Ligand binder design. Structure first.
Ligand code: AR6
Ligand code: AR6
Ligand code: MN
Ligand code: MN
Ligand code: MN
Ligand code: MN
Ligand code: MN
Ligand code: MN
Lengths: 153, 153
């Protein structure tokens, strides 16, 4: 049984016996390569007090499925559309939250539309800047970089 | 300025203006290969109501640095010790929490010690079971699988 301590906009906090649980909407993230650059985004993230390197990502809204949310986030954050393929999903931190992220690949990007900074960057370069302490990653940014190195070279 | 709504054992819930923020201890995770198998673990995770495929992981305790926490978690969860190398870090979900995960590689594993299920499994097989819907991943499990495919074949 869950007891709710807080019902919010983007999360709920519950207790389930001794466990502290944060309920959170599911998310999507989009991996996109063009001319050897990966599409990263950065924005201020008050939770961490900095702007980590992320890939385009967002919450799934009411009525939407993951593919539709992925299309919307890509367009809203970067002005692009592409051919989207589902890759895999993961729980961001299942020791305390149910947030699940669905990850897509986007191909054949086109500008559909001309706060969030678009940062095209070679993944090799993102990984080197991170190893040197120059940038932090979100899980989505790291998953994009590792996926590229595994499968897209 | 943060306003605190809840101060807990493994998180705090705060408001920072319009943002809902969950403070959380930093974590470590350990990627380990032996004879082509990756060291996964599974445990029931009440937040998600299932046991996703993870790698050995845990919270950094008071007094510890990430390397020490990684050594401890590996031993406590799997009875093993190894030669540990720092790889990279990521924020699990920086749109709402400050949880940061430090990821290590372990080599030359040895049994130091004879709830958490140890699951040695080829990463190729973990990825195929996940694509087929048979298992879910945590971020740490997916990062382990992608890192292997990128760098350890
Ligand atoms: N939700 C909870 N609330 C209260 N206490 C808990 C909770 N979960 C576990 N405990 C207690 O806290 C102790 C913590 O066990 P350790 O191995 O250091 O951590 P980990 O594996 O949980 O988390 C490691 C990362 O992996 C996952 O992605 C997580 O989300 C983290 O990001 C447990 O024995 C319980 O006593
Ligand atoms: N902590 C917050 N609390 C309140 N509202 C917020 C918060 N953060 C953003 N908003 C509002 O909610 C809207 C959400 O913007 P969208 O693009 O769909 O989501 P995303 O990119 O934030 O999160 C995507 C994933 O990436 C990260 O890993 C996250 O942790 C997620 O896992 C914002 O415009 C704000 O109005
Ligand atoms: Mn977003
Ligand atoms: Mn957005
Ligand atoms: Mn912009
Ligand atoms: Mn653990
Ligand atoms: Mn443990
Ligand atoms: Mn066990």
């Amino acid at each position: 049984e869950r007891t709710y301590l807080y019902r919010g906009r983007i999360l709920n906090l519950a207790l389930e016996g001794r466990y502290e649980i944060v309920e959170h909407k599911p998310a999507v993230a989009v991996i996109a390569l063009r001319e050897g650059r990966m599409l990263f985004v950065r924005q201020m993230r008050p939770a961490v007090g900095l702007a980590p390197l992320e890939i385009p990502a967002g919450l799934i809204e009411p009525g939407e499925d993951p593919l539709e949310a992925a299309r919307r986030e890509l367009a809203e954050e970067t002005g692009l559309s592409g051919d989207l393929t589902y890759l895999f999903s993961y729980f961001v931190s299942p020791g305390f939250t149910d947030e699940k992220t669905h990850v897509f690949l986007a191909e054949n990007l086109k500008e559909v539309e001309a706060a969030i900074e678009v940062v095209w960057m070679r993944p090799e370069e993102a990984l080197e800047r991170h190893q040197r302490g120059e940038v932090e990653f979100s899980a989505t940014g790291l998953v994009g970089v590792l996926y590229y190195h595994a499968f897209l070279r």
